[PDB]
Amino acid sequence: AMNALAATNRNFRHASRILGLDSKIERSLMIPFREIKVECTIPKDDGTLVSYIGFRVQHDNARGPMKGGIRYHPEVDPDEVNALAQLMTWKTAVADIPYGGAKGGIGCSPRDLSLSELERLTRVFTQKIHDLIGIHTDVPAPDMGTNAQTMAWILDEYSKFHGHSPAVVTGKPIDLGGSLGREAATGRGVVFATEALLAEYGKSIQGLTFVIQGFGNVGTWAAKLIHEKGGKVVAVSDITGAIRNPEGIDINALIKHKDATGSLNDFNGGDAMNSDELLIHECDVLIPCALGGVLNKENAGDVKAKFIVEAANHPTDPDADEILSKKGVIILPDIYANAGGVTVSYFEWVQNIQGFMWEEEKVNLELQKYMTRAFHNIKTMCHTHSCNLRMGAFTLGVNRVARATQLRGWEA
Amino acid sequence: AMNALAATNRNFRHASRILGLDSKIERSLMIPFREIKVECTIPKDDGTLVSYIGFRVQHDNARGPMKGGIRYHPEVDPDEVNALAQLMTWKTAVADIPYGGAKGGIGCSPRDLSLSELERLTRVFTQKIHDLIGIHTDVPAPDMGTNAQTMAWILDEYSKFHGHSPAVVTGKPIDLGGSLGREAATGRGVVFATEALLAEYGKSIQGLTFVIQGFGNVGTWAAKLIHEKGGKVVAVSDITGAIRNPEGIDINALIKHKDATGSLNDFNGGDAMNSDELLIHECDVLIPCALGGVLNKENAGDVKAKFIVEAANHPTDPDADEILSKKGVIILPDIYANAGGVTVSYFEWVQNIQGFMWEEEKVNLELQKYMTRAFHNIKTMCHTHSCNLRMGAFTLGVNRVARATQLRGWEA
Amino acid sequence: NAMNALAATNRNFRHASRILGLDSKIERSLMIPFREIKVECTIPKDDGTLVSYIGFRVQHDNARGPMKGGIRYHPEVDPDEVNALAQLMTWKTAVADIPYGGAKGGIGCSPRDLSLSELERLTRVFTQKIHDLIGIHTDVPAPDMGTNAQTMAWILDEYSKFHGHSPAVVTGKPIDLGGSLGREAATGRGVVFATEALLAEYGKSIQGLTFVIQGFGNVGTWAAKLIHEKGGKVVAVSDITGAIRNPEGIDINALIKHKDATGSLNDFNGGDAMNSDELLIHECDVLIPCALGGVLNKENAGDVKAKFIVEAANHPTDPDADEILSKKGVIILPDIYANAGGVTVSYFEWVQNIQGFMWEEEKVNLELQKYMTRAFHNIKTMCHTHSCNLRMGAFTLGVNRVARATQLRGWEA
Amino acid sequence: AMNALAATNRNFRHASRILGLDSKIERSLMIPFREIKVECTIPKDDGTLVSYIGFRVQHDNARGPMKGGIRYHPEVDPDEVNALAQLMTWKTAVADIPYGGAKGGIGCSPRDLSLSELERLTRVFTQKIHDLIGIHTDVPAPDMGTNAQTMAWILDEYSKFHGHSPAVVTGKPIDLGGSLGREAATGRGVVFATEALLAEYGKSIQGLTFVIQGFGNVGTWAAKLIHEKGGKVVAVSDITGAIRNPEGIDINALIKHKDATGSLNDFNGGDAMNSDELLIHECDVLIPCALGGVLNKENAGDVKAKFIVEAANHPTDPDADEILSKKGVIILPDIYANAGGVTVSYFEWVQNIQGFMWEEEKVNLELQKYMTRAFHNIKTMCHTHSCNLRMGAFTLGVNRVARATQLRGWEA
Numbered sequence A, B, D: 001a002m003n004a005l006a007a008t009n010r011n012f013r014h015a016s017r018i019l020g021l022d023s024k025i026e027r028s029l030m031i032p033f034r035e036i037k038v039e040c041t042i043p044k045d046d047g048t049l050v051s052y053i054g055f056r057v058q059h060d061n062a063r064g065p066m067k068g069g070i071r072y073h074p075e076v077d078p079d080e081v082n083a084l085a086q087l088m089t090w091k092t093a094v095a096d097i098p099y100g101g102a103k104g105g106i107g108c109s110p111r112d113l114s115l116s117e118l119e120r121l122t123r124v125f126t127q128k129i130h131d132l133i134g135i136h137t138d139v140p141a142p143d144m145g146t147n148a149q150t151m152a153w154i155l156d157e158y159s160k161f162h163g164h165s166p167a168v169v170t171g172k173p174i175d176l177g178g179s180l181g182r183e184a185a186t187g188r189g190v191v192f193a194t195e196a197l198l199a200e201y202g203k204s205i206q207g208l209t210f211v212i213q214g215f216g217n218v219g220t221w222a223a224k225l226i227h228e229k230g231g232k233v234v235a236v237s238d239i240t241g242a243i244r245n246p247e248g249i250d251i252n253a254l255i256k257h258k259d260a261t262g263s264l265n266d267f268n269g270g271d272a273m274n275s276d277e278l279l280i281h282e283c284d285v286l287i288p289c290a291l292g293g294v295l296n297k298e299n300a301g302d303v304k305a306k307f308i309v310e311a312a313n314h315p316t317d318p319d320a321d322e323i324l325s326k327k328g329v330i331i332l333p334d335i336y337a338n339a340g341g342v343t344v345s346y347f348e349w350v351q352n353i354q355g356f357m358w359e360e361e362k363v364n365l366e367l368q369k370y371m372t373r374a375f376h377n378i379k380t381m382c383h384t385h386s387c388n389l390r391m392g393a394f395t396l397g398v399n400r401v402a403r404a405t406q407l408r409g410w411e412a
Numbered sequence C: 001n002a003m004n005a006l007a008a009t010n011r012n013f014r015h016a017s018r019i020l021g022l023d024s025k026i027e028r029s030l031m032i033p034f035r036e037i038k039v040e041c042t043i044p045k046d047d048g049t050l051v052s053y054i055g056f057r058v059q060h061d062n063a064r065g066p067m068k069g070g071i072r073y074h075p076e077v078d079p080d081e082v083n084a085l086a087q088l089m090t091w092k093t094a095v096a097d098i099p100y101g102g103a104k105g106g107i108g109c110s111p112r113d114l115s116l117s118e119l120e121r122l123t124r125v126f127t128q129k130i131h132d133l134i135g136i137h138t139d140v141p142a143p144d145m146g147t148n149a150q151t152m153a154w155i156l157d158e159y160s161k162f163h164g165h166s167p168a169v170v171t172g173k174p175i176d177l178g179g180s181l182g183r184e185a186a187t188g189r190g191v192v193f194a195t196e197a198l199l200a201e202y203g204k205s206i207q208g209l210t211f212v213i214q215g216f217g218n219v220g221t222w223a224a225k226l227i228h229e230k231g232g233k234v235v236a237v238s239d240i241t242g243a244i245r246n247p248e249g250i251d252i253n254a255l256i257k258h259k260d261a262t263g264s265l266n267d268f269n270g271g272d273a274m275n276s277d278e279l280l281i282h283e284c285d286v287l288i289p290c291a292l293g294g295v296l297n298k299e300n301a302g303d304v305k306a307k308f309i310v311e312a313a314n315h316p317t318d319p320d321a322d323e324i325l326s327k328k329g330v331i332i333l334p335d336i337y338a339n340a341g342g343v344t345v346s347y348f349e350w351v352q353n354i355q356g357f358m359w360e361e362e363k364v365n366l367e368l369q370k371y372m373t374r375a376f377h378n379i380k381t382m383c384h385t386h387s388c389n390l391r392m393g394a395f396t397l398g399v400n401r402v403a404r405a406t407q408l409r410g411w412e413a
Ligand SMILES: NC(=O)c1ccc[n+]([C@@H]2O[C@H](COP(=O)([O-])OP(=O)(O)OC[C@H]3O[C@@H](n4cnc5c(N)ncnc54)[C@H](O)[C@@H]3O)[C@@H](O)[C@H]2O)c1
Pocket: A142, A143, A144, A145, A146, A186, A213, A214, A215, A216, A217, A218, A219, A237, A238, A239, A240, A289, A290, A291, A292, A311, A312, A313, A338, A339, A341, A342
């Protein structure tokens, strides 16, 4: 259970060492451009007040407007938001999209708030950060605990202060300027990333078994698209519980059952298992799709997967990376594998600022090209620097940010 | 040495209980409106880069634009800036000036920077916070390690972004719209505060002995104006050392000597003394004028003063308060005694927005009037609530802030 | 016959710089204006045909505060003149110890040749072209030659379309639109105060002395009227139409009525026509130029008969004339002091506007007197410190104050 | 050498008389929209101050945002900037790109300034004009003495005041939103223009001899691309000297030599020649790529070229035009032949505001289309008005600006 920012800074310092970065540049790159904490106090439906703290860490904007989602989750805190924001900086650079990195969140439990309370909280948070975000400054998006409806409320409230600004947030509903393909983009990108990786070993998804932790926006689309590529999704978990079927779970039936009952439990097409054995389940490919830090020094040694594809942000800490590398496990890093979301967010933003939307086929074709080119550039760094996939992506992104920073200069 | 924010929060909660504040209002008043941390990187004179982190905590704005200084000191960190900012909210309310509270700082050692480096650092910090401050939003000022020249640079840089804005900062040089009386205002207010307290016992400054920790903007003017009221300043210290004379130090001579040599303890008109027994020196009145938290559980039992007048922000922690109370020591609290600075800053801001400067005698007569009225209001709270001077001031300030907050309301 | 106005003003500035011992880099920075702006101003005439003018606003220096200075409509407006006038505003505001820097603007046009509707359109288009450059705490215009309170009303009205009601963006306004009591008369009244201050140093006063006035507009009429009411004998007056003299003194109130009724000073029953180019060399105790700059120059200065010159116009005496006149024993009270009653009461008008509350005229004129008395005292101090004449006493006072503010602001980016 | 603005105004008045332009419209089109001169004072690396005067002439914006580069050169003065700005107005209209004309510069010698000094000067200039330029107002670019790195500093400083604004300047580094093709664009467009001209005579570049004055952004690319189309570049000069080779200079070798030594002198593949006989050197096509006014009444009669293609701005004054016309020399005018720079600048601006960059193949294909179309419209004007190439282009541009001006109207 390592501190999230300590783990991410360890990876950053490793990448900086591989690159030979100057120490003063390295320090500047670590320090976020701006960290914001704001009081967010709303009346509950019964009129009583509740106060939350909202966060937006704006890590780096050398390569363009900052980009990253907003997490509503009880474990949101400054270290977590800082770690996620720094990862967005490297992720956007690896994807070669013209963004820097940011992240925000509120430490709350959304399932304990009514829809009207969530809307008020979202609008108050927007009132408290509207002057610090913007189409060409910092563009939020969903993350854990938020979704396209959350984004609609941000858009609606932001637009009161600045006029109609569809490009100020991505992950919007289609009817409010959202992009076709954005809902499925992170899971679909995970599929593309997994296919690029497996192809290096002469393999494809068909017939392989997959274990998925988390069953939300990322986990459901990754599970559904892997299954439709012929993969055997043999175990899935979420906050409610876990299920397994060694012949592969009928993911579409699982989605129906989850929507209808609110639970993975009592699914007819699988067996209840202990959630805390999900990550060490037998499989070809393990895909964490929920919280970070879940693969650590305590359980990494029990991981049975041959490949790990990080759909979640920072699911594997650096202690686990070492334990797993010794076990022969290949790890496709978060800052590449889950970048389908922010890549299609970039396409959404482009569509909005161009005032004209794309067909879904074009969105998904561009997503594939970007994921293919990013993986190609990662492999080049891995070869240049004789390093593993995580450090190939991390050095790629750090190097691109350092270049843009140096071009912009340092005089006042 | 107790954590500064923990110490201030202990005092705040006690005050809230005295007032019977609802627990949700109590929590809201603790949480700052907005906390900002920004990277401040400059080239040094030799061209090499140095990176600092700048802070501005905007604690509360219910009563008006936020107000508070900018500290350049190596121990600046988020807990310190948050504690100072919260104290500004109570202090402005105690003074009955139409401001809320804020504070900023950079963790740096100004003596280690050249004048050109300090100017670049000040201008970059201003570039990083200009969108967060403003004449009717948040109005900075000096504190430890900054002075009127610093404020000139903030004014000059801010005005590039928003046009000429003299009232955006106070403590300015007279020639750029500063107020007569502001340089001396905190020390002069300390004198008025001390006179008010002493008169409750039939006493005057004339003939009493005083010990002063620190010899900067606050300590020099407190010592000089006490001396000119006939007080005997028997010991003085600063970062370089300490000097004592039980007959009274010639403060004007000491000021000349300090300016000529940069040190205190080789002064002809006194004897060197160990700086670490200054606070426990025999005196009628002890006036800390340097860092916070210097009267604590380790040394409070050895304090020999009959009265403590808090010129520094939070020089006495709550452990020390309890120890000193049992010894019969009477403590005039920071949020009253040092409020001359922010009160004359209010007058400076008024003069700027009115476009027309006042004579110094008007500034100082208004300062006296405000300090006499605030002391009376503190005494009223002390009598109503049967509480000590610190809690009289804290409850006065918190109550005023809570009242403004409740009038503004909570709907979105 | 005149020196170039900017060369003349820079020669005075360089001399003041030398007296003060200014560093050469600071000297150069203080010469260079903050910002010079030239804009096309094209309007339809009443018959629909187009006419194009060039408008100027030179923002010379803002170290001491919002820039301040009038707008001139006159055929001889050009960049050198506007730059010279703007630089003089910087020193004048500093001499007066008001919290402003210096700017000036203008249009090279002949207002007499435009209809009122054409003048209004031109003024509104000029405002449209510079509204983003000026502002209550940035640059605050005012009248000058060829413009008046009605001109300022149109600037206010057009500017407020872009920025909301902004009374303090311009001074010299009509009283009924936020103007200050006392501003119409302020420059002439300040000229009297300044003259009284100077004469008192010689144990004299206005009563019984003789005065010659060149120009009979906002400045010249009020200087002449108020001098006359203090017992001065105004023995010659000119404007663009002609010149009249009466060695026993002209009835200024009668002359005002005659000029109003006929549009001319000529054929006034209470004086004698004279050659307008002998006006400045007429016998008198005190000569007060109240029209164009550079009118005392190499060609006529040696024939000046006045004992005192009080500069109500901006830069009426060039440095060649200064030197000639100094050898003749003529004492010259400089424009950047003597005519500062206008900008001083403009400051008061601006204060009243931003404060939302207007003053009585008695308060305005009492404050004007205080400011003019204090400024003269400070000029005398500089004269004594630097062993220099009145012009250099004022110039060094202003330059020193601007340099001090500049140094405090600093130079890093 | 004639006055630059007098020469350009003479060409403008000539074009207006060909068009029968209304005399009032003519006068308005001559008068620039807005001329700006600003103080630019910086500390040097040793801390001493230096003051420059920065200029931005915004000549005409009837057809759209104004466009034109920034020159750092000791001969920069108001007449030169006014002349270049008026030429940008006609050039943009000839190219049929939706821009008006502007130009800027600072009278300085960049080679006498350090890189940090150049950066501070550039940033201060930007501070002084940021309120007067903008994506839809006035978009600068490089010119003599500035380059992509200069533009990066303008972008960076401007974005402090207005947020990230990549389209505010063109000629940016690729890694900061620059366009592929922009660096080579002016020289490449010179090639296209020359090819369109020569084709009118059944000629092409291959085999012909060229002389080039200047060897910077424009001269190096023009010479390189001409040589790669089989042209014989027989003489080249820059500020350091001149070389000739009647069999053709190896331009790639000359570039490498120039880079390594900083001089064209002592190039192993050419002979020194007197650089003030470069323009009168025997050749088929003469291409000035440096200062304006270099062909004048004194040397035009000695010109030996058959064609002059004006890559520099206003290299030929009207006295020379007449002398050369009598000699049968054909002159392809600057406002057409060098328009590849601004045309690809337009594509860069488009890419930036669209948030999505183009392939270089597309950039260069569009450049060719635009240059071919502009030449066709110039020939149409030459035939309609029985005038030479300069007046065909000048009348095309003036007529397009006059039309847009008339549509906008004149009431307040
Ligand atoms: N949404 C995106 O576009 C996107 C993009 C890239 C990366 N990510 C990352 O993907 C991960 C999932 O995000 P999401 O958008 O799917 O969130 P979501 O809120 O839609 O779903 C989160 C899922 O995780 C489950 N979960 C929560 N705690 C769990 C626990 N302790 N054990 C097991 N399951 C648990 C929830 O029940 C739910 O199934 C996060 O790390 C997020 O930062 C999201």
